[PDB]
Amino acid sequence: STGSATTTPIDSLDDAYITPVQIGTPAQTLNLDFDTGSSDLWVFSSETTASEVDGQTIYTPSKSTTAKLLSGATWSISYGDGSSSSGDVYTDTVSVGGLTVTGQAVESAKKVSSSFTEDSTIDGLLGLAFSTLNTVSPTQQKTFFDNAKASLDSPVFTADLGYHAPGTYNFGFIDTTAYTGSITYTAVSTKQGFWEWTSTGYAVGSGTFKSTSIDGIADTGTTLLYLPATVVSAYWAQVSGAKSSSSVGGYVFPCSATLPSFTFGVGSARIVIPGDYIDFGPISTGSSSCFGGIQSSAGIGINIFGDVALKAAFVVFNGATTPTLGFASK
C-alpha cells in the first residue's frame, strides 16, 4: 500500500504545516501537524476542556462506530517550545492520503496548553518519530507509520514541504519526479528516539564551505533551524544590523534586509536554503525588526533541522530495519 497527502502552511510565514487526516467511522477529518520530532497522535476532542477550544475541529469518539476506549490508558506530553497536552486514548481507524491503519491509538485531549488553544488551524499532532518516545501509559503505543510500515510497498515516508506553498507527505514510495539530482542517504541514530543524524558542515551565502560535524534531528514539527552558536553567529554577521535580542528571544534583523542563503551538508551533498526562507517577519505587528529563521541551539541541548531546513529539500525517512535519512535538492 501507499498514501499521499498534501500538507499546507498554516499562515503566510510557514509557521507550521497541516495535513488532513481521516479518523473514525464515518470519517472525521482533522488537520494535523505531522511531527517527525515526536511520537504521539493526539487530537482536540469532545473531551477537551471547552474554554481551551477556540476554532479547532474536534474528534468525537462517541460518533465513531469503530472507536474503542483503551481502558486505563492516558497520555501527557510536553514539547520543546513549552507547550503541552494530555488526555485519554481510543483505538480507531486512521487514514492519511488513502493509506489506512485500523486499531491506531488516537490520543484524545482533555487538556491543552494556551499555545494550542490560540492556534485555531491545528487540530492535533501526528507523531512520526520512533515509537519509543510515545507517552501513553501504562502501555506504550505505536505511531501511525510503525503500524502501517509492514503494509507499505517500501518502509519509508517522505516530506516535501513547500515555501509559501503546499507540499506533500508520501507513505510507502519515493516520487522520483519530486526532486532534482540524486538522494544522498546518511546514518541515523535512534538512541534518543529521534531521526538523529550528522550534517557534514555549512556555508553562509557564497562563502566557503566549512567541514564540521553537526549532530541534530530532522524535525518537521519545529519551525526554525537551531544550530550551534558559532554557526549562527557566522550567519547573522553577514546581515547588516542583525543582532541577538535577549528581550525578543533570538536573532532579529532589519525587515529591509535581503538575507543570504545557508547551505548544509549531507555527506558530500549540499542543500541550499534560500535567504528568503530565513525571514519570519516582524517581531510584533507593525515592527520594522524581523525574526530570524536560524537561531542558536545553545540551551536547547540539541541541534534541530526544522522546517526552515527541511523545506529546502526532499527528505526520505527510511524506516527499514536500520533507519536512514535521505536528502535531495528540489
From Swiss-Prot:
It comes from the Eukaryota. Disulfide bonds join 255-290. The chain holds residues 90 to 419 of 419 of the full protein. GO terms for biological process: proteolysis. It comes from Cryphonectria parasitica. Its EC number is 3.4.23.22. Residues 17-328 form the Peptidase A1 domain. Coiled coil: none annotated. This is Endothiapepsin. The keyword Nucleotidyltransferase does not apply. Keywords: Aspartyl protease, Disulfide bond, Hydrolase, Protease, Signal, Zymogen. One of its GO terms (molecular function) is aspartic-type endopeptidase activity. The active site is at 35, 199. Belongs to the peptidase A1 family. It catalyses: Hydrolysis of proteins with specificity similar to that of pepsin A, prefers hydrophobic residues at P1 and P1', but does not cleave 14-Ala-|-Leu-15 in the B chain of insulin or Z-Glu-Tyr. Clots milk.
